Design a protein around this ligand. Structure first.
Ligand SMILES: Nc1nc2c(ncn2[C@@H]2O[C@H](COP(=O)(O)OP(=O)(O)O)[C@@H](O)[C@H]2O)c(=O)[nH]1
Ligand SMILES: [Mg+2]
Length: 171
């Protein structure tokens, strides 16, 4: 059984919790329910490999979190989430990426860019704008909807695949 420690980062309100809960529980949390920062473990088969995913869904970024500091230090791959109807959250992506590189003191960290809420007609971030940002970082870009269950597994499984390739190349 292969472990992958994943960290979901990005601005408040973009759907990090909704994406993680959809993946873990196949449920969509009610729109107005309290979010909480928490970690989740789930055994899953990914490309025929039996995997243990250890996922931290981050929150409360303006106060100390011992768990978040541990997962940022030790996390193996990062899902950088913005919402496609929220330009500020997309324009925040470079700060989240910079935080990750600083903690890892590395320019080469497994990451996937995720544009969530692709079920909303009020899009303000064009798919091609985000694809270009991801291309400039050298990482995959995936558009998701936690609500209509579009590409949720693809987003997380793609990050696992990025970690697997990182490991294979370094050896
Ligand atoms: N329409 C839609 N709303 C979403 C989606 N994902 C999250 N939300 C809503 O967006 C708000 C923020 O979601 P949340 O998971 O709490 O975001 P976090 O703060 O990034 O964890 C909540 O009201 C969610 O119900 C999605 O894919 N589509
Ligand atoms: Mg949350």
């Amino acid at each position: 059984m292969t472990e992958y420690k994943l960290v979901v980062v990005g601005a408040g309100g973009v759907g990090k919790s909704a994406l993680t809960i959809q993946l873990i529980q196949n449920h969509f949390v009610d729109e107005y329910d309290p979010t909480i920062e928490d970690s989740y473990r789930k055994q899953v088969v990914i490309d025929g490999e039996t995997c243990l995913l250890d996922i931290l869904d981050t929150a409360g970024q303006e106060e100390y979190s011992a768990m978040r500091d541990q997962y940022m230090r030790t996390g193996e791959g990062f899902l950088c989430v913005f919402a496609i109807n929220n330009t500020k959250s997309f324009e925040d992506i470079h700060h989240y990426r910079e935080q990750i590189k600083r903690v890892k003191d590395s320019e080469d960290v497994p990451m996937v860019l995720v544009g969530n809420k692709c079920d909303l007609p009020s899009r303000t971030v064009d798919t091609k704008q985000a694809q270009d940002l991801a291309r400039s970082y050298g990482i995959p870009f995936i558009e998701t909807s936690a609500k209509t269950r579009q590409r949720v597994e693809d987003a997380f499984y793609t990050l696992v695949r990025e970690i697997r390739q990182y490991r294979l190349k370094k050896i």
